[PDB]
Amino acid sequence: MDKIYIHDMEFYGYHGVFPEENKLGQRFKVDLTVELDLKRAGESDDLEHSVNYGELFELCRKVVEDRTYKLVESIAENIATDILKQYESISRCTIKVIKPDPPIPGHYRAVAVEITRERP
Amino acid sequence: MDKIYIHDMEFYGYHGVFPEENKLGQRFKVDLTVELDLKRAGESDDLEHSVNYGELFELCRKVVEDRTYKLVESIAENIATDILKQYESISRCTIKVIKPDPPIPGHYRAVAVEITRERP
Amino acid sequence: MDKIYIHDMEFYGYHGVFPEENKLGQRFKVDLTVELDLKRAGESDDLEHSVNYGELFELCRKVVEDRTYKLVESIAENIATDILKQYESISRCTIKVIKPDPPIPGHYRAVAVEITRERP
Amino acid sequence: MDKIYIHDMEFYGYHGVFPEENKLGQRFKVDLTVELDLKRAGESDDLEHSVNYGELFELCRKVVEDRTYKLVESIAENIATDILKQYESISRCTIKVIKPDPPIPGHYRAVAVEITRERP
Amino acid sequence: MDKIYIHDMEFYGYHGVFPEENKLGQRFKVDLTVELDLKRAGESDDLEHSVNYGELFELCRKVVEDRTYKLVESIAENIATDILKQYESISRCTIKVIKPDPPIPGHYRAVAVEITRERP
Amino acid sequence: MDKIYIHDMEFYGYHGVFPEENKLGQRFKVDLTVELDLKRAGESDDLEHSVNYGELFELCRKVVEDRTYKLVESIAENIATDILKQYESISRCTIKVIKPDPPIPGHYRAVAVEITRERP
Amino acid sequence: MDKIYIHDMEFYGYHGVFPEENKLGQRFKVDLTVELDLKRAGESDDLEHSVNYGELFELCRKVVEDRTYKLVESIAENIATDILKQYESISRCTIKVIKPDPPIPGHYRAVAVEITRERP
Amino acid sequence: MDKIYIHDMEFYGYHGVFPEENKLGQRFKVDLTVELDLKRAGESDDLEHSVNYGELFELCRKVVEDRTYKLVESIAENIATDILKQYESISRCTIKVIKPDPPIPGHYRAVAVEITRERP
């Protein structure tokens, strides 16, 4: 189905299991995909037949920056949950939450969680 | 099925919902995928058994640069529509339209719309 | 299904078919994907309802750096095997092992092996 | 199924429709994916239960550099054809041939053709 | 002399000569370099003898995001001036203010201004 | 002195010694640096005391795309000359003209020429 | 003079002023440059007349990973000092210590310190 | 003075002190800069007054791929020497020879040597 993307949103949050992460904080990145039929929007050039991605950004901003969880998994679930609650037009969404600088002695690009959620 | 790609075409257009975007303009990027059986072209080395991607580029150039819409969704729909009208050989096409520098206070790589279209 | 990623882990190992590779060694990179239902972890914000990716990293570290095989294929199989043995919560995993600097006179980015493994 | 990759092989060839491309030549890039069950190779650490990707590279080198076609589509077909002829172990392969610097006045990253081929 | 760098700070600001830029805003990037004797700090491992680069970031964040000018030149002049004003130990500084997405119809990576300042 | 940059302007031109290049064309890139006192502009926030870099882009776009030379050296000389001719406040400039895709059989990122010019 | 470089060495260390950084750790990067006359080595193809850069790496790995300081300035000072101490043929060196992921709430690529050292 | 660059030439060579490197080989990269007066060439658009950079590439390809040394220092010395020997108009040159994949157990981007040469 037609999809809207928001690529590589960068936030600074305080999520983590260690209390030392809650004090220091670190970068968190989010990739967003929402599914929805967008033919009526492109047919009509009318934004009410689509979804404002500027709001989609503010949703992820609040979950990552205005809150503090232990698991990045909780970030993905609350982001996806809040997407499906407020946009009935969206049928399904895939949320990827990236932790690029975790306290994992080693060498890597990032660790990440990725979920797909739809309504029952 | 066999596919032709045109990766990361960069245009400068004036699409957007805000009138201040229509005056200033901004970058727009398009990723194109068309589906079509290309065995006969590779078997014969004859361009009429394939599709000239140089024309495929000019199609996207006109829709993004020679026109001004409100929604990038309308860019993807008109690009895909004009592909399917003029190339009967193409069975299906996926159009991705990227807005890398939208007026969204925040931090991200881009927002994008992506559709898949075929004939009825 | 919900997935955990570990992107682009870089190790230095001594795997290879040529004995001259076993003496010199070279870079090896691993991309990891594990499948598992992570709703209960995001619902509860409790790490025991998910998998510690810091351990997931140490698993790949041992297979690539604490051992020496002939084939990178054996790296992917042992990494995936050791994932499925120790985490019953993981249903399926996809392992990609990258050899970026092989003794292949030519020009390329990398050669890689990629497998998907689940329990019988 | 298990897969072997060769990422972003760079060659210099003389393929093209215009005679001016046949004289000047240009860069050509190839991404290769072959499908084959690699458990027996990783189980045994024995290269005869897998495929030498160094030969896989030389196959693409000859088709792109030792020959001159009109269409890049013919490059993908002959590469895939020669893969399936010489390696019965390979069940399916996907070939992507990239033309990064075509004579297309405009702005883009590349144009490319991508096919998937198996035995009848 | 010795140097401290703060590489590629990314902000969202509303600078610009045109009124449409002040309403819409756009990304702004800053590269910072300051010059000072760091030998005492490295020998003694004592921040008392160096400059907190977390403050240097806040100084830059202040000019770009807490203020709105017509010119990016004014960002560079006010960042620099604020530095020599507050840090006696800093002898010289080079400020580079990047406007990656200006309203210039064309194809480019960015435009920027760079200044170097010391005390008379 | 202080500096203005226009980083990685990308054009499509028909420069080249060989006649086949003039018919086919290829990408051309230009890095621009101009030197001038920017202190008045940053202090007063007044473009009257600086140089419109939107014009500096158009000057470069003029030489590369509105003209065809044999040498990229001629691009650099004509860009520079046009700058010192039109901008009294500019004391010195460095022009770098990149030919990323020349017809040189080989493996490389680009070839380029760079000149620096001031008034006698 | 002539120069040897060791570009973008990546380590994991526990440096930092805050106690939480010493417990958690983070990535540290180092760019190394040493200056020395290399003409004898290039003319004679004899390492006896140059410096083993495998040792230069181990010297850097020693300071970053075998030691823990408060300041990255101390990394640079101890790397440099260890170089001029052990390599008579090296006349001057420039050390740059990068902290890509400091606990600074904000958006940036990295912060770093850079020193240059010679003998009195 | 004015300059010509040949950026990131990639070769495959068999240089190295250890015998295992000579048997296996590895990538080698070269950055070239030559200095010369280019004003005549840019003013007259006449290659007669400049240097064919296609030859400069072949000179570099000659030393790296047609020869095998112990040291990368010898690559730089022989590339430079061959340049000042064959191009009277070139006043000075800087050669940088990159060994991206040396057999150093560790994590880094590359090691390299850089020399600058002029005539006595």
PDB file of C-alpha atoms in Angstrom, chain E:
ATOM      1  CA  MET E   1      48.491  26.335  18.926  1.00  0.00           C
ATOM      2  CA  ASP E   2      46.326  23.546  20.334  1.00  0.00           C
ATOM      3  CA  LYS E   3      42.692  23.341  19.330  1.00  0.00           C
ATOM      4  CA  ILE E   4      39.234  22.220  20.393  1.00  0.00           C
ATOM      5  CA  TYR E   5      36.642  21.350  17.754  1.00  0.00           C
ATOM      6  CA  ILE E   6      32.817  20.923  17.891  1.00  0.00           C
ATOM      7  CA  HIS E   7      32.135  19.301  14.472  1.00  0.00           C
ATOM      8  CA  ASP E   8      28.845  19.717  12.524  1.00  0.00           C
ATOM      9  CA  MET E   9      26.471  21.126  15.157  1.00  0.00           C
ATOM     10  CA  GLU E  10      23.010  20.992  13.568  1.00  0.00           C
ATOM     11  CA  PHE E  11      20.358  23.539  14.526  1.00  0.00           C
ATOM     12  CA  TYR E  12      17.013  24.687  13.157  1.00  0.00           C
ATOM     13  CA  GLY E  13      16.818  28.469  12.817  1.00  0.00           C
ATOM     14  CA  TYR E  14      14.812  31.235  11.173  1.00  0.00           C
ATOM     15  CA  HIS E  15      17.625  33.392   9.786  1.00  0.00           C
ATOM     16  CA  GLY E  16      17.369  34.806   6.286  1.00  0.00           C
ATOM     17  CA  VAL E  17      17.032  38.020   4.328  1.00  0.00           C
ATOM     18  CA  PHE E  18      13.740  37.041   2.705  1.00  0.00           C
ATOM     19  CA  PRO E  19      10.669  37.233   4.984  1.00  0.00           C
ATOM     20  CA  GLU E  20       9.556  33.773   3.852  1.00  0.00           C
ATOM     21  CA  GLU E  21      12.684  32.235   5.391  1.00  0.00           C
ATOM     22  CA  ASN E  22      11.961  33.798   8.788  1.00  0.00           C
ATOM     23  CA  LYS E  23       8.474  32.267   8.780  1.00  0.00           C
ATOM     24  CA  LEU E  24       9.508  28.827   7.517  1.00  0.00           C
ATOM     25  CA  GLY E  25      13.012  28.351   8.920  1.00  0.00           C
ATOM     26  CA  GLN E  26      15.642  25.861   7.825  1.00  0.00           C
ATOM     27  CA  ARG E  27      18.609  23.864   9.038  1.00  0.00           C
ATOM     28  CA  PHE E  28      21.782  25.663  10.103  1.00  0.00           C
ATOM     29  CA  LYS E  29      25.127  23.979  10.789  1.00  0.00           C
ATOM     30  CA  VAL E  30      28.188  25.329  12.591  1.00  0.00           C
ATOM     31  CA  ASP E  31      31.787  24.114  12.706  1.00  0.00           C
ATOM     32  CA  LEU E  32      33.700  25.513  15.682  1.00  0.00           C
ATOM     33  CA  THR E  33      37.444  25.742  16.251  1.00  0.00           C
ATOM     34  CA  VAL E  34      39.089  27.514  19.200  1.00  0.00           C
ATOM     35  CA  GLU E  35      42.819  27.922  19.830  1.00  0.00           C
ATOM     36  CA  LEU E  36      44.436  27.826  23.261  1.00  0.00           C
ATOM     37  CA  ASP E  37      47.301  26.160  25.106  1.00  0.00           C
ATOM     38  CA  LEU E  38      46.093  22.706  26.171  1.00  0.00           C
ATOM     39  CA  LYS E  39      49.400  21.421  27.567  1.00  0.00           C
ATOM     40  CA  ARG E  40      48.492  22.091  31.202  1.00  0.00           C
ATOM     41  CA  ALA E  41      45.180  20.254  30.811  1.00  0.00           C
ATOM     42  CA  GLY E  42      46.687  17.190  29.146  1.00  0.00           C
ATOM     43  CA  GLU E  43      49.542  17.010  31.641  1.00  0.00           C
ATOM     44  CA  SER E  44      47.345  17.474  34.726  1.00  0.00           C
ATOM     45  CA  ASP E  45      44.112  15.838  33.471  1.00  0.00           C
ATOM     46  CA  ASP E  46      42.346  18.832  35.042  1.00  0.00           C
ATOM     47  CA  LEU E  47      39.460  20.602  33.292  1.00  0.00           C
ATOM     48  CA  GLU E  48      40.289  23.672  35.383  1.00  0.00           C
ATOM     49  CA  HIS E  49      43.056  24.263  32.812  1.00  0.00           C
ATOM     50  CA  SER E  50      40.884  23.816  29.699  1.00  0.00           C
ATOM     51  CA  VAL E  51      37.489  24.916  28.363  1.00  0.00           C
ATOM     52  CA  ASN E  52      34.250  22.983  28.852  1.00  0.00           C
ATOM     53  CA  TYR E  53      33.173  22.216  25.283  1.00  0.00           C
ATOM     54  CA  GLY E  54      29.658  21.546  26.581  1.00  0.00           C
ATOM     55  CA  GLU E  55      29.520  25.282  27.220  1.00  0.00           C
ATOM     56  CA  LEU E  56      31.007  26.019  23.794  1.00  0.00           C
ATOM     57  CA  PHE E  57      28.077  24.083  22.333  1.00  0.00           C
ATOM     58  CA  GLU E  58      25.573  26.042  24.411  1.00  0.00           C
ATOM     59  CA  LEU E  59      27.151  29.322  23.264  1.00  0.00           C
ATOM     60  CA  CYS E  60      26.639  28.245  19.645  1.00  0.00           C
ATOM     61  CA  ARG E  61      23.142  26.901  20.297  1.00  0.00           C
ATOM     62  CA  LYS E  62      22.360  30.289  21.821  1.00  0.00           C
ATOM     63  CA  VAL E  63      23.202  32.392  18.784  1.00  0.00           C
ATOM     64  CA  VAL E  64      21.644  30.108  16.176  1.00  0.00           C
ATOM     65  CA  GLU E  65      18.433  29.052  17.940  1.00  0.00           C
ATOM     66  CA  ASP E  66      17.741  31.821  20.482  1.00  0.00           C
ATOM     67  CA  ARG E  67      18.241  34.596  17.890  1.00  0.00           C
ATOM     68  CA  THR E  68      17.167  35.442  14.349  1.00  0.00           C
ATOM     69  CA  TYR E  69      19.332  37.475  11.987  1.00  0.00           C
ATOM     70  CA  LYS E  70      19.180  38.343   8.311  1.00  0.00           C
ATOM     71  CA  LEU E  71      22.709  37.089   7.605  1.00  0.00           C
ATOM     72  CA  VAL E  72      24.580  33.919   8.498  1.00  0.00           C
ATOM     73  CA  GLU E  73      27.515  36.334   8.702  1.00  0.00           C
ATOM     74  CA  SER E  74      25.868  37.708  11.852  1.00  0.00           C
ATOM     75  CA  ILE E  75      25.714  34.213  13.358  1.00  0.00           C
ATOM     76  CA  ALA E  76      29.463  33.801  12.870  1.00  0.00           C
ATOM     77  CA  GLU E  77      30.293  37.256  14.231  1.00  0.00           C
ATOM     78  CA  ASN E  78      28.130  36.817  17.337  1.00  0.00           C
ATOM     79  CA  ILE E  79      29.351  33.281  18.046  1.00  0.00           C
ATOM     80  CA  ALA E  80      32.973  34.410  17.779  1.00  0.00           C
ATOM     81  CA  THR E  81      32.490  37.607  19.784  1.00  0.00           C
ATOM     82  CA  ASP E  82      30.720  35.665  22.535  1.00  0.00           C
ATOM     83  CA  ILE E  83      33.683  33.268  22.672  1.00  0.00           C
ATOM     84  CA  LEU E  84      36.520  35.771  23.016  1.00  0.00           C
ATOM     85  CA  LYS E  85      34.325  37.638  25.516  1.00  0.00           C
ATOM     86  CA  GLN E  86      33.806  34.698  27.869  1.00  0.00           C
ATOM     87  CA  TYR E  87      37.036  32.665  27.523  1.00  0.00           C
ATOM     88  CA  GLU E  88      40.193  34.540  28.402  1.00  0.00           C
ATOM     89  CA  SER E  89      42.310  31.457  27.710  1.00  0.00           C
ATOM     90  CA  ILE E  90      41.135  31.255  24.079  1.00  0.00           C
ATOM     91  CA  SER E  91      43.526  33.173  21.820  1.00  0.00           C
ATOM     92  CA  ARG E  92      41.793  32.747  18.444  1.00  0.00           C
ATOM     93  CA  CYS E  93      38.741  31.055  16.967  1.00  0.00           C
ATOM     94  CA  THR E  94      37.423  30.118  13.533  1.00  0.00           C
ATOM     95  CA  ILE E  95      33.646  29.920  13.066  1.00  0.00           C
ATOM     96  CA  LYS E  96      31.968  28.442   9.984  1.00  0.00           C
ATOM     97  CA  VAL E  97      28.193  28.789   9.601  1.00  0.00           C
ATOM     98  CA  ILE E  98      26.650  26.451   7.031  1.00  0.00           C
ATOM     99  CA  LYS E  99      23.289  27.015   5.323  1.00  0.00           C
ATOM    100  CA  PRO E 100      22.811  23.573   3.709  1.00  0.00           C
ATOM    101  CA  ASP E 101      19.389  24.357   2.200  1.00  0.00           C
ATOM    102  CA  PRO E 102      19.267  27.984   0.992  1.00  0.00           C
ATOM    103  CA  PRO E 103      16.542  29.096  -1.461  1.00  0.00           C
ATOM    104  CA  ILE E 104      18.929  29.096  -4.437  1.00  0.00           C
ATOM    105  CA  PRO E 105      17.441  27.272  -7.456  1.00  0.00           C
ATOM    106  CA  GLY E 106      20.305  24.952  -8.368  1.00  0.00           C
ATOM    107  CA  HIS E 107      22.233  21.814  -7.350  1.00  0.00           C
ATOM    108  CA  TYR E 108      24.842  21.995  -4.562  1.00  0.00           C
ATOM    109  CA  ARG E 109      25.667  20.643  -1.098  1.00  0.00           C
ATOM    110  CA  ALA E 110      25.647  23.891   0.899  1.00  0.00           C
ATOM    111  CA  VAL E 111      26.721  27.514   1.121  1.00  0.00           C
ATOM    112  CA  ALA E 112      28.583  28.833   4.140  1.00  0.00           C
ATOM    113  CA  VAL E 113      30.582  31.691   5.625  1.00  0.00           C
ATOM    114  CA  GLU E 114      33.760  31.336   7.678  1.00  0.00           C
ATOM    115  CA  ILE E 115      35.477  33.912   9.884  1.00  0.00           C
ATOM    116  CA  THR E 116      38.572  33.963  12.081  1.00  0.00           C
ATOM    117  CA  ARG E 117      38.795  36.331  15.038  1.00  0.00           C
ATOM    118  CA  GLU E 118      41.408  37.304  17.615  1.00  0.00           C
ATOM    119  CA  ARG E 119      41.750  40.160  20.041  1.00  0.00           C
ATOM    120  CA  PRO E 120      43.447  43.409  18.888  1.00  0.00           C
TER     121      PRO E 120
END
